[PDB]
Amino acid sequence: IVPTRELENVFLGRCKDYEITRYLDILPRVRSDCSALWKDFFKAFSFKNPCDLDLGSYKDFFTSAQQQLPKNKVMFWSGVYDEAHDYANTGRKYITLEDTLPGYMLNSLVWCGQRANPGFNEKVCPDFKTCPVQARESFWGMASSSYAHSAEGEVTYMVDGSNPKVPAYRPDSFFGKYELPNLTNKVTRVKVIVLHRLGEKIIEKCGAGSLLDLEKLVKAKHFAFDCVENPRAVLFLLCSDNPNARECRLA
């Protein structure tokens, strides 16, 4: 595992690119400049062993970088990365973490502390499995919480309903750990979209199994709940990438 080259430059360029040209009509600018954001980011991990972090490490970075989020537009997802992002459509239909400023700046990047100068490793980072969970999950854990905590109105949640190993919904997922429990009374409704991958056994449905657990979880938060399996707009995206599938048949 090799850390990203020139982390600062990459960070600052993405930041600046975003500030000036990305999501102008879709998401707000943040107060802080890019240097202030770098400093809040860099201090969370710098000059410490790579496993020396906890859930508060990136807090200041997150307070600074957190945008207000448009009401009704926030998408969550589990095990269906590509499909959620394709349906969300780079912010035209839904917002994901990746469209926000910090998710955008840190997407796919690899970084870690070391004690010795220059304060970070330029060679190798530990496998995440070696660090305690609080350190391992310090960045995306906090990013997940911050993003969820900012959601207003309706929220959408896309899941895999054809994984035989992994339930559609799980408390131990990032959604289960950081997102759902952090949704505030500004949220009105959790709309689930269940993906049944084309040509695969259907494993989970609305009203059954882990989806029934979710339903209950949600009502107890006092939100409203709906659930739908392969709605047509999602179905159609699945079918462009597999047009010969039985599910994508005309006439």
Add this chain to the structure above:
Amino acid sequence: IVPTRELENVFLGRCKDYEITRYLDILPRVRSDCSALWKDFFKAFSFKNPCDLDLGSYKDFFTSAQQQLPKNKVMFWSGVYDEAHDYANTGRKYITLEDTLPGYMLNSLVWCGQRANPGFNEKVCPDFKTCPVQARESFWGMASSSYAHSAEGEVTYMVDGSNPKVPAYRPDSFFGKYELPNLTNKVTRVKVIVLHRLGEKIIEKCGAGSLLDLEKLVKAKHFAFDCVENPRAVLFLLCSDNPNARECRLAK
């Protein structure tokens, strides 16, 4: 018209992010560093009246910034930007100009030279619909030529087939003026995709009108040629935006 603010820092930040993180398994890095590429880009329009630009103003920029392009992967489009970009899918199915370094760096950006210091106008840029052709198309003109010149194998051309005012193929489109003519014998085939927008009149069709005109040109340059209208993978894409259109009806 309003120029992009902090043009240099946008260019530079864009170029470094692309360099270290973008399209890594899809598109080659260029030899030249970001700093150098700013220079070639700046010198091209800097310290000249805006309309004082020609086909060759950005030739040095493009030499430095041109990447080789994966065979069978390049896509050109005319009149159907969003669909073509959606269908190409950020370089996974096809590559577009805006997936390339120069395309990625300058996409959306707005800029212009002035005679006086600092040589560019951070405050205003003329209605470029008022500059001479060669000067208004000086930048994307060169980009398109260079892109086309770098294309290898089969190329795809997606076109609007439901436009009564604008032929699917014209010799004065960016395609007709700068791409088609710059297709080298590295190219073997032009595969035309015709977009019949959902619930509009079909205007053009494979083998008639401008398309037959296109087909004749392509074969003259000794490439192979084919053409389809709304292939299913494209249809399905359009239907996601308009699920209740007549032409997206599905089986019982």
